Amino acid sequence: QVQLVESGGGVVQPGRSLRLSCAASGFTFSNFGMHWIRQSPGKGLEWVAIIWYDGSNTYYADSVKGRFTISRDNSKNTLYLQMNSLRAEDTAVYYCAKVWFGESEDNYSVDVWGQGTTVTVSSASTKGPSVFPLAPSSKSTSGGTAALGCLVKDYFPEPVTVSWNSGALTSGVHTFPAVLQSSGLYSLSSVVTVPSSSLGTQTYICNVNHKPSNTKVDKKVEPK
């Protein structure tokens, strides 16, 4: 069927430029107009640009007019979005989308969305995480259940993976979504509930992995 694959996203310092591409297949790309639409946690879904099938007419949202340039290569079946002078608020997931087929006098929107590519505009430098133990004790015990975890603080960029005992422990694991701090570094927590009767004898190690920095940390969590 119709398939759209975005590429080109990544981390870019503010003020630099970045060019996103969208490869289309499964349909005659040159016969359809296309949209770029972005989604961010702060503003939700936000339309960015539209281009005609032949590129003759282009339109842009007011917040991006004069900075973004949408183009297309019908010989390569590729849609492009050149983004210049990026600001912090442009961090979002960008989707390309295909206009549906309709009647000649109707208004038009999109029916098939691409997979999406993440763009993160930040002045933070690549940095491995700090792993701190969340040690269980009597003050974090209610009955026969205790909670322990690992705090993964001050890392950039996204994402990081957390496993327990090389993946052998998955029941009761809650890895929270990362939060952006004032320093531009991300931070999250991973917690697990265990039987209190197993504390002191069963070994629990959290395995934090951060591919952008090739960081691998195995932190042992012991009770207090």
Partner: protein, 212 residues
């Protein structure tokens, strides 16, 4: 430089099946596309040119289709002679070939036989230690072999080798060779290869102790 890409990389099929492989170009090459067949240990042979013209002498069960940037090769009814590797080639701007699609003989699932071999004393006397893990007569080809030395995973010190599909039963054989210095080998005790395969409900682990 026009990039070519073929999908899928490997296709498991049986005699009489309908086979369709695809090929895409980084830019428009119009209809100037050729398909070449190559059998192992043999020179490539021309099958189709101009994307849909059948070469003289080629049986009619081969057909081509496509134009612009997307092209397909179709075999209506597979025959045992058609098990080979198929390459597409644009000749619109210079000449670039795709990575190639190998047509594999589909058969029933067969679990591997696992054997482990320790380094010989003669090689240890020579200053090197090779440990060999063997997977015999398995299908499909996808499997994972992990080397563990005193329960520590190795990386960058092993090499793998795979045979072609056996002519008699269409199975694979795989050899994994872990190479270490005599000092590294004698500085540890337990040597294991762990194997995972979709036909195995649980991973299989073979291990020995140095000197045992």
């Amino acid at each position: 430089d026009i990039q070519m890409t073929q999908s899928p990389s490997t296709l498991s099929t049986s005699v009489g099946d309908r086979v369709t492989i695809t090929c895409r170009a980084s830019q428009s090459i119009s209809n100037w596309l050729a398909w070449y067949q190559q059998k192992p240990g043999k020179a490539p042979k021309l099958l189709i040119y101009k994307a849909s013209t059948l070469e003289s002498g080629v049986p009619s069960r081969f057909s081509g289709s496509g134009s612009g940037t997307e092209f397909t090769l179709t075999i209506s009814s597979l025959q045992p002679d058609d098990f080979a590797t198929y390459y597409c080639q644009q000749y619109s701007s210079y000449w670039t070939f795709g990575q190639g699609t190998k047509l594999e003989i589909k058969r029933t699932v067969a679990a591997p036989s696992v054997f482990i071999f320790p380094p010989s004393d003669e090689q240890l006397k020579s200053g090197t230690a090779s440990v060999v893990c063997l997977l015999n007569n398995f299908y499909p080809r996808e499997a994972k072999v992990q080397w563990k030395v005193d329960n520590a995973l190795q990386s960058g010190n092993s090499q793998e080798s795979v045979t072609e599909q056996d002519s008699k039963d269409s199975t694979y054989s795989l050899s994994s060779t872990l190479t270490l210095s005599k000092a590294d080998y004698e500085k540890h005790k337990v040597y294991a290869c762990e194997v995972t395969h979709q036909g195995l409900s649980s991973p299989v682990t073979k291990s020995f102790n140095r000197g045992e």
